[PDB]
CSV table of C-alpha atoms and ligand atoms in Angstrom, one decimal:
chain,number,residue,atom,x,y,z
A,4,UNK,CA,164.3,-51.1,-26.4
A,5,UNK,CA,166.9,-48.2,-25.1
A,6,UNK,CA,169.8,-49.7,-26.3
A,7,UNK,CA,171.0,-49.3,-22.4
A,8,UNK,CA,172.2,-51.5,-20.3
A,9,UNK,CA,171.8,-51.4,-16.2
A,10,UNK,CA,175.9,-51.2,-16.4
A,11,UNK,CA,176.4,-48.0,-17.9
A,12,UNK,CA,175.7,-46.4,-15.3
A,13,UNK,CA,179.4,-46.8,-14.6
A,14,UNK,CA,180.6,-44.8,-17.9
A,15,UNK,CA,182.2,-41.6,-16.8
A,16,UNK,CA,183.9,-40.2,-19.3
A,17,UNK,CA,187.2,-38.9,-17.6
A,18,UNK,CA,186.1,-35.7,-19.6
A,19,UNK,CA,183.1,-34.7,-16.6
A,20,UNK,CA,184.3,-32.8,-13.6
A,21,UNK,CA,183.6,-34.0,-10.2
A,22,UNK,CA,180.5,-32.2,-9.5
A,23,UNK,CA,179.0,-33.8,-12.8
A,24,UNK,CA,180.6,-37.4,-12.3
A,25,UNK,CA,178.6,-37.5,-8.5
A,26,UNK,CA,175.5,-35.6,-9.6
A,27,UNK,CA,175.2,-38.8,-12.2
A,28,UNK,CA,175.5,-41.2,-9.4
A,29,UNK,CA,173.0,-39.9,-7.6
A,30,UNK,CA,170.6,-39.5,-10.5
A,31,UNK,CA,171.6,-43.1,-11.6
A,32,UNK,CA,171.1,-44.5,-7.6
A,33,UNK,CA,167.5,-43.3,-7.9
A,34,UNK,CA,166.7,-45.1,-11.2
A,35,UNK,CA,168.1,-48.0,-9.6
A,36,UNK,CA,166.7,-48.2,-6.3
A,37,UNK,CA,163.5,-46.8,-7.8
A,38,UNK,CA,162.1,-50.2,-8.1
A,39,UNK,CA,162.3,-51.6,-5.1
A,40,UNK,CA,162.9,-51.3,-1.3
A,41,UNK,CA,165.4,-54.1,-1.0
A,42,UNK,CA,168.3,-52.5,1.3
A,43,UNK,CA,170.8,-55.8,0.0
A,44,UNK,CA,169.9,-54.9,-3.8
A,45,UNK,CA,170.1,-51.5,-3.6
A,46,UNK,CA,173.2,-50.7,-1.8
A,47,UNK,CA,175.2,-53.7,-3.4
A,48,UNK,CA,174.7,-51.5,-6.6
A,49,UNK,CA,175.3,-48.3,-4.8
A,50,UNK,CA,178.6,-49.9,-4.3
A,51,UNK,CA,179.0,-50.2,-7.8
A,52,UNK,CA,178.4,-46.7,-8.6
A,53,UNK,CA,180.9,-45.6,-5.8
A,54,UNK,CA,183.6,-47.5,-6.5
A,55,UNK,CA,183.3,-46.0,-10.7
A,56,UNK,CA,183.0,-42.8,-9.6
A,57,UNK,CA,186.0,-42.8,-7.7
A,58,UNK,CA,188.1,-44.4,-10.0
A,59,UNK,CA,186.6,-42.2,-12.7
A,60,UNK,CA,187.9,-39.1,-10.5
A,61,UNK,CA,191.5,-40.6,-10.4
A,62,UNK,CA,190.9,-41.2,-6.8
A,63,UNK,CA,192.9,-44.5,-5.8
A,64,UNK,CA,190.3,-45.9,-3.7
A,65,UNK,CA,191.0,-49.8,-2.5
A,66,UNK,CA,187.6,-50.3,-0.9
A,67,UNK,CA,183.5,-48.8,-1.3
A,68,UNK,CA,181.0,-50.6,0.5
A,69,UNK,CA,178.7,-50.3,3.8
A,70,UNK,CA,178.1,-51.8,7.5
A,71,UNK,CA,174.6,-52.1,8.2
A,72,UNK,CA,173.3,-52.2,11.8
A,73,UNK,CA,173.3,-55.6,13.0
A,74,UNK,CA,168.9,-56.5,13.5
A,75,UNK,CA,168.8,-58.0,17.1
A,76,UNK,CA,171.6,-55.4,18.4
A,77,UNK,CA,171.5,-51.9,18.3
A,78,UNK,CA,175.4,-51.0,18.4
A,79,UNK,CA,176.7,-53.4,16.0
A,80,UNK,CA,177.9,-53.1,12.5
A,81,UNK,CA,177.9,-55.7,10.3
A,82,UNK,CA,179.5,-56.0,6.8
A,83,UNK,CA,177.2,-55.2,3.8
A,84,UNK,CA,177.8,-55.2,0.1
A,85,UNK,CA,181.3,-53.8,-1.1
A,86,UNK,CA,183.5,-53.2,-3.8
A,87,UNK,CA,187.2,-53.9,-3.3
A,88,UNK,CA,188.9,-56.7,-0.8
A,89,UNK,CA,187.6,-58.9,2.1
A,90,UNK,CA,186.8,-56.9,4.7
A,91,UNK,CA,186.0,-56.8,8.7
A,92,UNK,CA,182.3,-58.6,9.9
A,93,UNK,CA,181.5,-56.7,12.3
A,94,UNK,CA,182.6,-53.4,14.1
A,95,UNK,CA,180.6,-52.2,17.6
A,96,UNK,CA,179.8,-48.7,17.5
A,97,UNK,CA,182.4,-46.6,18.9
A,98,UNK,CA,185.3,-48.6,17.6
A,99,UNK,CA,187.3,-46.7,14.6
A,100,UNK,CA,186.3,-45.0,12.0
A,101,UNK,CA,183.0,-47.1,11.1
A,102,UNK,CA,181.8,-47.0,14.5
A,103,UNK,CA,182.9,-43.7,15.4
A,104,UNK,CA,180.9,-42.3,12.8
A,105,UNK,CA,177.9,-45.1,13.7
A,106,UNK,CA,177.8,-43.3,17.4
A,107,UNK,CA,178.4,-39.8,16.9
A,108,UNK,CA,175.8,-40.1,13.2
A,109,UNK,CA,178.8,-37.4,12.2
A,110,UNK,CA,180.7,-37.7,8.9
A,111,UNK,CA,184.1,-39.0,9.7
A,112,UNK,CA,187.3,-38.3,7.2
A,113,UNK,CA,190.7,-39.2,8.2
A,114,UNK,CA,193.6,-38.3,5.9
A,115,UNK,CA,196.2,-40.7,8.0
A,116,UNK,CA,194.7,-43.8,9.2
A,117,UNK,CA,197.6,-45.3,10.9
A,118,UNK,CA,197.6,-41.9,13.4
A,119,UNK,CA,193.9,-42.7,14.3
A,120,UNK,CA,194.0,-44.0,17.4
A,121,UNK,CA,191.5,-47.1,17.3
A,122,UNK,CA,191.4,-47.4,13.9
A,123,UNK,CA,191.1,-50.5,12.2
A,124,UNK,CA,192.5,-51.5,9.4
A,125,UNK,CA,190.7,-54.3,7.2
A,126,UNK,CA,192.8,-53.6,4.4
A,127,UNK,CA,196.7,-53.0,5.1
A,128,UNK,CA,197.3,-50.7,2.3
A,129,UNK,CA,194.7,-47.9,3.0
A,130,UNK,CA,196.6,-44.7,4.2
A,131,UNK,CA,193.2,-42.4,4.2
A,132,UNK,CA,189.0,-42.3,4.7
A,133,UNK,CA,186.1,-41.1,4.5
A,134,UNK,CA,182.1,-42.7,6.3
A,135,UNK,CA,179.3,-41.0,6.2
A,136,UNK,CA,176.6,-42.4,8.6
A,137,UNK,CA,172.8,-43.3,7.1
A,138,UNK,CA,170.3,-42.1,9.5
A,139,UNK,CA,166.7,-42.7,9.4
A,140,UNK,CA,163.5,-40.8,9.7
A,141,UNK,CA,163.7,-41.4,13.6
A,142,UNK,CA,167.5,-40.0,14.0
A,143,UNK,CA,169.1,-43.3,14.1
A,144,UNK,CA,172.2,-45.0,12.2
A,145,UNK,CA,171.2,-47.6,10.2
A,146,UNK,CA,174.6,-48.3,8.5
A,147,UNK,CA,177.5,-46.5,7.3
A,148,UNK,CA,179.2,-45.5,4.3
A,149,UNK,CA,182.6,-46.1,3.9
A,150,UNK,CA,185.4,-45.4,1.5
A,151,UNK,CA,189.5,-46.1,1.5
A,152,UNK,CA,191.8,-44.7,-0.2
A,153,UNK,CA,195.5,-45.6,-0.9
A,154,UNK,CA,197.2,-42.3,-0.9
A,155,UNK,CA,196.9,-39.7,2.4
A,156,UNK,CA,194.3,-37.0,2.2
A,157,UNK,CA,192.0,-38.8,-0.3
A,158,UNK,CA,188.8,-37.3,0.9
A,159,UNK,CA,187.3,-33.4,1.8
A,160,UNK,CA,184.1,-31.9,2.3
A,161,UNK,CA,182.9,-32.1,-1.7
A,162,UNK,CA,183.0,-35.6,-0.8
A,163,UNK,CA,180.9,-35.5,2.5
A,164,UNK,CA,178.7,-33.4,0.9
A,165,UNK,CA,177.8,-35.7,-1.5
A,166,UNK,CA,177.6,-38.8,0.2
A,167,UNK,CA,175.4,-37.1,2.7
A,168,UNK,CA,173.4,-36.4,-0.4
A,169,UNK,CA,173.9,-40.4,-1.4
A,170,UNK,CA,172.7,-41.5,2.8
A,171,UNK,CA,170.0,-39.3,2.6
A,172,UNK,CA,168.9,-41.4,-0.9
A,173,UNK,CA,169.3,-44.8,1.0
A,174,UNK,CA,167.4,-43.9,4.1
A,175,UNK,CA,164.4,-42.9,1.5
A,176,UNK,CA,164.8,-45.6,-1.1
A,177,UNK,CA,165.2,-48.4,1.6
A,178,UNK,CA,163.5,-50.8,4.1
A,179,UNK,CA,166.0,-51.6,7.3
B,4,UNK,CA,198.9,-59.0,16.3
B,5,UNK,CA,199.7,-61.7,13.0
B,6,UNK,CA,200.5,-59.2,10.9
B,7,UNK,CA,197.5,-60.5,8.7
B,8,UNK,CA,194.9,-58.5,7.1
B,9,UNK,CA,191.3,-59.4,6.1
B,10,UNK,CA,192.3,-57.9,2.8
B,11,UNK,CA,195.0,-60.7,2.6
B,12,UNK,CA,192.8,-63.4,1.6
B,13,UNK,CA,192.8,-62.0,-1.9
B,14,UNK,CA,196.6,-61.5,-2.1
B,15,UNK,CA,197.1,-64.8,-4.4
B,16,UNK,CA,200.1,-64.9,-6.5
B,17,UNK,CA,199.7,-65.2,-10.3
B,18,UNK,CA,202.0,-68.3,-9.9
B,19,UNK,CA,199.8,-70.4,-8.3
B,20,UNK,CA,198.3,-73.7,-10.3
B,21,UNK,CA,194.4,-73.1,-10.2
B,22,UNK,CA,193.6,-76.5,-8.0
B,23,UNK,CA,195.5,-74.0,-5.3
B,24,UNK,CA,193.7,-70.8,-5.7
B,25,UNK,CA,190.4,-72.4,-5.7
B,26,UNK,CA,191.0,-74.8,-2.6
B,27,UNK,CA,192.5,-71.6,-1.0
B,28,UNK,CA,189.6,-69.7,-1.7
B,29,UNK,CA,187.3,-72.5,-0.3
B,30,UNK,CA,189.6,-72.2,3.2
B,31,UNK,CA,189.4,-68.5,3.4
B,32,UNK,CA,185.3,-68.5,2.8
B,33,UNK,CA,185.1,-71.2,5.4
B,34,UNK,CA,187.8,-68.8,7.8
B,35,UNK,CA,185.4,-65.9,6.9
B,36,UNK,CA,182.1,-67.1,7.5
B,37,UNK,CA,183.3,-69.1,10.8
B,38,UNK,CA,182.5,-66.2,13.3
B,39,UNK,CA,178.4,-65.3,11.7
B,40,UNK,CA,175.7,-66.4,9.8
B,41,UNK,CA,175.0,-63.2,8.8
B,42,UNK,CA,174.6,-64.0,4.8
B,43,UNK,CA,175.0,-60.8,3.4
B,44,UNK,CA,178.1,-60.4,5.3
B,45,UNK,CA,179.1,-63.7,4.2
B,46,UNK,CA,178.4,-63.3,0.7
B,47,UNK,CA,180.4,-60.0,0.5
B,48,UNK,CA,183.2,-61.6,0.7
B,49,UNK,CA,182.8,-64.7,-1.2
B,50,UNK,CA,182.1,-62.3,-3.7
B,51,UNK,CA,185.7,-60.8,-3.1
B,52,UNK,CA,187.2,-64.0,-3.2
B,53,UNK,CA,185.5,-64.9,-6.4
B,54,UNK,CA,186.6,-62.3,-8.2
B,55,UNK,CA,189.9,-62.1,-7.2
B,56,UNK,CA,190.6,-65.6,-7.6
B,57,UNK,CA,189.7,-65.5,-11.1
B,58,UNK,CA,191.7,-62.2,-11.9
B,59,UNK,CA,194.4,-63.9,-10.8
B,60,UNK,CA,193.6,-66.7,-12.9
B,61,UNK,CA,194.2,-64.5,-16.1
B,62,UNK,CA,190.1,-64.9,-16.1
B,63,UNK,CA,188.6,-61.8,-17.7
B,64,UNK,CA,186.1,-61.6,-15.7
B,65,UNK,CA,183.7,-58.5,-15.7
B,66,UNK,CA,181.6,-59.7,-12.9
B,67,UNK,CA,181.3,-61.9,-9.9
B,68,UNK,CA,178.6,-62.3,-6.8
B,69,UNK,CA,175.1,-63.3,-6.2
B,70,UNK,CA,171.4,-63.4,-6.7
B,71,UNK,CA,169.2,-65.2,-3.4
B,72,UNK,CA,165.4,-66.1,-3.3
B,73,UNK,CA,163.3,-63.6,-2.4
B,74,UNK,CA,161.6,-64.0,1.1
B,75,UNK,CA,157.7,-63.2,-0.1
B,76,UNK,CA,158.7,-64.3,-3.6
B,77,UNK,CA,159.4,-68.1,-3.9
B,78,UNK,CA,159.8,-67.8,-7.7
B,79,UNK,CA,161.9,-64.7,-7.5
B,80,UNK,CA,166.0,-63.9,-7.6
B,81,UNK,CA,166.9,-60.5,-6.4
B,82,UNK,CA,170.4,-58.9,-6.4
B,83,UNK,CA,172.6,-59.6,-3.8
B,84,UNK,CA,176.2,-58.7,-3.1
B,85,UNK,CA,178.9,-58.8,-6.1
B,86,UNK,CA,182.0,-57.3,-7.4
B,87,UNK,CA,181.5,-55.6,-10.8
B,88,UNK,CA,179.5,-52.8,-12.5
B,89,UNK,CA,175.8,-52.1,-12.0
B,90,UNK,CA,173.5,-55.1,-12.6
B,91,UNK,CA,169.6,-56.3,-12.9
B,92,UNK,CA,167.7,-55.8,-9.5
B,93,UNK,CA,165.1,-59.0,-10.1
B,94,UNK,CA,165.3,-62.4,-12.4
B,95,UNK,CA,162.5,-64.5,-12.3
B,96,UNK,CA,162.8,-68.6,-11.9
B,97,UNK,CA,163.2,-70.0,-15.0
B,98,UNK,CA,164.1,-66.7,-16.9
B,99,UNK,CA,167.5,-65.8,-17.8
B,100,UNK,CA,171.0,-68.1,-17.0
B,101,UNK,CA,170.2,-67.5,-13.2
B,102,UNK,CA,166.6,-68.1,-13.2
B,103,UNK,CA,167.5,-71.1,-15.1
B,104,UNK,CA,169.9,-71.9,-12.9
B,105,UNK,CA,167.1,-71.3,-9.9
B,106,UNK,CA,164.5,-73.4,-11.5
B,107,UNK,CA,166.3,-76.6,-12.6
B,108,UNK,CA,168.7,-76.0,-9.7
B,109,UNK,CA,171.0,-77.2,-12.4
B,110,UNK,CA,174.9,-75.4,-12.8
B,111,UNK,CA,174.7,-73.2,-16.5
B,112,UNK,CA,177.9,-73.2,-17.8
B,113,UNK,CA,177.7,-70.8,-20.9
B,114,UNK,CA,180.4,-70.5,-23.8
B,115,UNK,CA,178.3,-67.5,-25.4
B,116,UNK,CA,175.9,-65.6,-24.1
B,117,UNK,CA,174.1,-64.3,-27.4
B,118,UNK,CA,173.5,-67.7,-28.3
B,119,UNK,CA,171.5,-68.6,-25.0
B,120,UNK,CA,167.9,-68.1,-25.5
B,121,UNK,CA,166.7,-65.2,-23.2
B,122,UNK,CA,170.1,-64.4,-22.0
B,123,UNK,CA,169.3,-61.5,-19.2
B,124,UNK,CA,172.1,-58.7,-20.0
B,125,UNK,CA,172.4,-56.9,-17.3
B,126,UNK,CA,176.5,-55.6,-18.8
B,127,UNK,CA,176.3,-55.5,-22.9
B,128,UNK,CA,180.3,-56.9,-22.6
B,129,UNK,CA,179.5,-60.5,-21.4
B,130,UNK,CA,180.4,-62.7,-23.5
B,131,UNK,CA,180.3,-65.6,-21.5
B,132,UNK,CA,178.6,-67.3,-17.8
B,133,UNK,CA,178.7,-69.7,-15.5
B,134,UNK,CA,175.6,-70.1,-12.3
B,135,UNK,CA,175.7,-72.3,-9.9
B,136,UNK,CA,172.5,-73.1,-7.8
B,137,UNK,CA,172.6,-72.6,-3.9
B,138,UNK,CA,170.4,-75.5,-2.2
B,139,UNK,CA,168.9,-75.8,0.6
B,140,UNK,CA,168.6,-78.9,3.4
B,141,UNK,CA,165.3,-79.3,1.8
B,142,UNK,CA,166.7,-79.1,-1.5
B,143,UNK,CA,165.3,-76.1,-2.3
B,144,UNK,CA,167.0,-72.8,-4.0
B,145,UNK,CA,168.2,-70.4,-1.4
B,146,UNK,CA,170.2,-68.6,-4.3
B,147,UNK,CA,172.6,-68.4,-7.2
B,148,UNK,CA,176.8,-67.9,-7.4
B,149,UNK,CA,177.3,-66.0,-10.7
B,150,UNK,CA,180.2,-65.1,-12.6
B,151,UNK,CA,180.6,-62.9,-16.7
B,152,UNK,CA,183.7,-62.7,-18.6
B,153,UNK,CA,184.5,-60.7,-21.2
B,154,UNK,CA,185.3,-63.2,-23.8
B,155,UNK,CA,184.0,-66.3,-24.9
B,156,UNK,CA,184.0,-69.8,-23.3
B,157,UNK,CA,185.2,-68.1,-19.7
B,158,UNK,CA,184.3,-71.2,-17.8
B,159,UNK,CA,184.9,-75.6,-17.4
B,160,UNK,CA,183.3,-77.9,-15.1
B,161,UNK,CA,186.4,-77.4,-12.5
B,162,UNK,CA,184.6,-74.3,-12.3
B,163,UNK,CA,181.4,-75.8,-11.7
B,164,UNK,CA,182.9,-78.3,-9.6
B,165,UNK,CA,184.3,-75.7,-6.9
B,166,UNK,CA,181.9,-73.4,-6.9
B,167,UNK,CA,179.6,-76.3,-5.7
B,168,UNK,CA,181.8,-77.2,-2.9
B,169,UNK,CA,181.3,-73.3,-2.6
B,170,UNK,CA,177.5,-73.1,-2.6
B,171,UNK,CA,177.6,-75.7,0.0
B,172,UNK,CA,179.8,-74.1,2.7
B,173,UNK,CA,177.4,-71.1,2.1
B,174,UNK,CA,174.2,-73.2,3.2
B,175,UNK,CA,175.9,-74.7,5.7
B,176,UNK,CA,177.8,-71.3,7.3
B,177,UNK,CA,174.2,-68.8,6.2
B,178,UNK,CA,170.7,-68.3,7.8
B,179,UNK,CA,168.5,-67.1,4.6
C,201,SME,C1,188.6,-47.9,11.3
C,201,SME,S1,187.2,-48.2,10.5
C,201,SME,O1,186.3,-49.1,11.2
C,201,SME,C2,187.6,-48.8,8.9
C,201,SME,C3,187.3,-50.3,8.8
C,201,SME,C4,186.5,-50.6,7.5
C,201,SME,N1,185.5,-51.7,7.7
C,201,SME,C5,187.4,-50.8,6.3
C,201,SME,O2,187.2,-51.8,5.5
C,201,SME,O3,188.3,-50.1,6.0
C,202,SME,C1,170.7,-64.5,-18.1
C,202,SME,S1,171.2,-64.4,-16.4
C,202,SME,O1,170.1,-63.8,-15.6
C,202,SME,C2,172.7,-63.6,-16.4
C,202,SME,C3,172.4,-62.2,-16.1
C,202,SME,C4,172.8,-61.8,-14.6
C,202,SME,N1,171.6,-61.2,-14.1
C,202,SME,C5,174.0,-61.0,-14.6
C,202,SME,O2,174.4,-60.5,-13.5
C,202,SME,O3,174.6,-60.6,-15.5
């Protein structure tokens, strides 16, 4: 026996710098999802590892979580695994941040929600954030990830490129 | 617009008896669900709403979501949505509090953890459990509701007794 146990994965020192902190998550989402090919399983913990990570980096995140295209319709979000508060079912692509990022498969990162025109808010107090969109091996969304953050300009391309990193993981790692 | 949030749902007052948080969670699940059967984004939620509630219970709670029956597997949990750190991917029936829980389809209220034969820790902290079987029309398990906490002797059969009511309004609000 290791002496391990599946959750510390979520110890991060407050000693690591960021690079280190989201090289670990992505290192820790493989040994994870290694397993299996369950999308529910896999990104609930990815949710996990987010949500840590962030707070490990002194980000004041409030929400870290995904919408997953719906299975019938092709331009439908619906709420997936998440860490935080209660959040929106279901977004149609094209509609704020989440489905903004769902139709143009483009990263999206917003420092002032409440001046995004169409933006909406499942959670009152977020002031900033960040999806990345998770596209298969065909070119299409399959979900989304998202992040909010309490504070204004939360989020910047060290981010993106990472969670890019983290979509590019899930597409591999899971059946849709 | 009401001026309401999604997020809202989990902004209980600490000054609330817990017969009120509880019933108020079982309205909000029930207000949640409503609009889809969509049990992922269902469960979300009720995860958020679990683990809320019992923060705000003064509950030390380190984690608080689900495991459902695999669709090949008819003898097999797999992780499904929670709130809390990193956790076990697959439980089989009769192993562990939840597959206990699956196979008996009987509630496992637990006092201390390291005193339950074959105790599955997925987070070394636990010190305490309660699982609650998810039953189907045809009285078969669909799933499990599970909650840790931190110390000993987290949980009580008003516990149980909710999060029955609970497991119900998810059979009868989910397509698994
Ligand atoms: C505007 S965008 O769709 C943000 C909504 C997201 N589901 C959230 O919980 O913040
Ligand atoms: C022993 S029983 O399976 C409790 C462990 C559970 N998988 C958890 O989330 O902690």
């Amino acid at each position: 026996s290791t002496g391990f146990h599946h959750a510390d994965h979520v110890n991060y020192s407050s000693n690591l710098n960021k690079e280190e902190i989201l090289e670990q998550l992505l290192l820790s989402y493989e040994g994870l999802s290694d397993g299996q090919v369950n999308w529910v399983c896999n990104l609930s913990n990815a949710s996990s590892l987010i949500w840590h990570a962030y707070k490990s980096l002194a980000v004041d995140i409030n929400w870290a979580g995904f919408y997953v295209t719906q299975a019938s319709e092709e331009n439908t979000l619906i709420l997936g695994p998440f860490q935080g508060k209660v959040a929106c079912q279901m977004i149609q692509f094209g509609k704020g941040v989440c489905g903004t990022a769902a139709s143009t498969k483009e990263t999206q990162i917003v420092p002032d929600v409440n001046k995004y025109p169409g933006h909406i808010a499942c959670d009152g107090e977020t002031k900033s954030e960040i999806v990345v969109p998770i596209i298969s091996n065909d070119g299409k969304t399959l979900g989304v990830i998202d992040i909010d953050c309490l504070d204004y300009e939360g989020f910047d391309h060290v981010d993106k490129e990472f969670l890019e990193k983290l979509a590019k993981l899930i597409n591999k790692s899971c059946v849709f």
